[PDB]
Structure formats: structure tokens, C-alpha cells
């Protein structure tokens, strides 16, 4: 287990780390998109709380994203899927901040657990979609793969899309969007990327995640212990030992960090307008 570094404590330390470090891993969760208008999973107004209400027939809200339940009955998921399908939201200040870090070559990687694709919209390139996305779908039985456009219609009509290859009378021959469900493997990209990154990372920043789900939650314990770790989150994570704890809205906290950093980071915050010559 990783113990906290005693020589890294203050927000001033955090800023200096951000100035000097050149191989930063940023690990993000649903928190970074709530300001965009996308609720998280585990908060009072989150996805799981809403599921407990709108789908009370489930053993528990997690069953909606559980592979063993999905195989038993995929109808709930496809009634609900269109609600979490990537809409037309704009990236938050935090996405833009990560994009700038990448643009400046300081971002080793952004591991995101989100499926809202806001990282792409923000122009972050060195990203890993730890928990997949709606970009493709795959038959549960034969593994036939299709693009999202092939099943999009069925999703927005709340019907279970069928495999076109498998027998037309095969009940489990359905096209599951390649989002990672409980009991499923994460994409191979994740594992390869982590093997490359763990001995390279010189700073870890966790933003807007409860880190309650493995293997993503294992990242902080799987990198070298001396690597500094910063948390930016509404709630502390008692099961881990971060060096600096910045608690509150990530956009508020990132905004403050951007101003201390100056340069292009300060310019990222265009509202309100800063003093400048016309």
C-alpha cells in the first residue's frame, strides 16, 4: 500500500509539480462531466439513484450494467441506453485543461472511465477509454462487430438489436454496445497502455472519481510509490493516500490552478474577460 509523501502537501506544491512534471497521468471519472450537465453514477442525483426509481424490478441498480444480468434479460438496458448515449454537450474547463497539457506534451495519458466522448470533443489525443464506448457493438454469441450507426436506430427505439449473422431464432444473439459491464474485461488498449505508462509516469492526478471500481481503482497502487499523487474531487477517498487533497468542484479548483500556472493555462479561463488591449 502506498503511503503519503511527507514533503508534498500544499496547493503551492501541487502547482510546482504541474510546472515541472512532464509525464502526467490524469485519471478521470464521471465527476469531470457533471458541470457539463451529465450526472455521475453514485451521488444523490446520480445514475444509480435514478435507476432505483425508474427500474425498481432490478435486483439492484448495478444490474443495469452487469453482464450476467444482461444475458438473462437485455430489455431493461436497451430501454435505458438512449439516456446515457453521447449527446451534444460541451467540454468542461477540466477537459480543456487536460487538452492543453497534452498539446504542450506534458500529458502521458488520460485514463477516463467515462463514455460521453467529451475528451475527443475537447481535442485530448492521448486518451484511453477504460470502460469502452458506444462507438461499436458486438454479438454476445458470435462476436460479430458493427459500428454504432448500425444499432443506433434500435437504441433510440428502445428495442434489442439483433445479430445479422447468427441464427434468426437465437435468443442471445444480440448486439451489445462495447461499454464495459461488471464481469467483463476492459479493452486490451487499457492493459497495454498501463504496462507502458507505469514506469514512465512522474505525476498522478485523480479527478472526479470515487475509485470504487477495479481495475481502474488499482492504478494509484500499481505505480511507483514515490510518484506524487494529487486528488481533485468533491469527496475524499479514504481507501487511498494522496499527497495533496483538493476537495470541491473540479472546475473551481482547476480554475484556481490555471491562474497560478499562468501562461496558456490562465488564458483557458476566458470568462470573465481578463485585462487586455483591443
Amino acid at each position: 500500500m502506498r503511503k503519503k509523501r511527507k514533503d508534498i502537501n500544499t496547493i503551492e506544491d501541487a502547482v510546482k509539480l504541474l510546472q515541472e512534471c512532464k509525464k502526467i497521468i490524469v485519471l478521470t471519472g464521471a465527476g469531470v462531466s457533471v458541470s457539463c450537465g451529465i450526472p455521475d453514477f453514485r451521488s444523490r442525483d446520480g445514475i444509480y439513484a435514478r435507476l432505483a426509481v425508474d427500474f425498481p424490478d432490478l435486483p439492484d441498480p448495478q444490474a443495469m450494467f452487469d453482464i450476467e444480468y444482461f444475458r438473462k434479460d437485455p430489455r431493461p438496458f436497451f430501454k435505458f441506453a438512449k439516456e446515457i448515449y453521447p449527446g451534444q454537450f460541451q467540454p468542461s474547463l477540466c477537459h480543456k485543461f487536460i487538452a492543453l497539457s497534452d498539446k504542450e506534451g506534458k500529458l502521458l495519458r488520460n485514463y477516463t472511465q467515462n463514455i460521453d466522448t467529451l475528451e475527443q470533443v475537447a481535442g485530448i489525443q492521448r486518451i484511453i477509454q477504460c470502460h469502452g464506448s458506444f462507438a461499436t457493438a458486438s454479438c454476445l454469441i458470435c462476436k460479430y462487430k458493427v459500428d454504432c450507426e448500425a444499432v443506433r436506430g434500435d437504441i433510440f427505439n428502445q428495442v434489442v438489436p439483433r445479430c445479422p449473422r447468427c441464427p434468426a431464432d437465437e435468443p442471445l444473439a444480440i448486439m451489445k454496445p462495447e461499454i464495459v459491464f461488471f464481469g467483463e474485461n476492459l479493452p486490451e488498449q487499457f492493459h497495454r497502455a498501463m504496462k507502458y505508462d507505469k514506469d514512465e509516469v512522474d505525476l498522478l492526478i485523480v479527478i472526479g472519481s470515487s475509485l470504487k471500481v477495479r481495475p481502474v481503482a488499482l492504478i494509484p497502487s500499481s505505480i511507483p510509490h514515490e510518484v506524487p499523487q494529487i486528488l481533485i474531487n468533491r469527496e475524499p477517498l479514504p481507501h487511498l493516500h494522496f499527497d495533496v487533497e483538493l476537495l470541491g468542484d473540479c472546475d473551481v479548483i482547476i480554475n484556481e490552478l490555471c491562474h497560478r500556472l499562468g501562461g496558456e493555462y490562465a488564458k483557458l479561463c476566458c470568462n470573465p474577460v481578463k485585462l487586455s488591449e483591443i
Binding site: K4, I8, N9, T10, I11, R234, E235, P236, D243, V244, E245, L246, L247, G248, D249, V252, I253, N255, E256
Partner: peptide
Amino acid sequence: GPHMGSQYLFLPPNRYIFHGAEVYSD
């Protein structure tokens, strides 16, 4: 931004509390 969005509450040695922190709820 929010009320006093630039100010934080410091719990030494390394915890900073900003607007939006869950500790303000209940």
C-alpha cells in the same frame, strides 16, 4: 463563479476545501 469561489478552507497539512465540497451538504 460561485460565492467566494477563489477561497478555500485549509485543514493542515494537505487538505483544501473549495466550493462544491460534499462536506458542506447533509
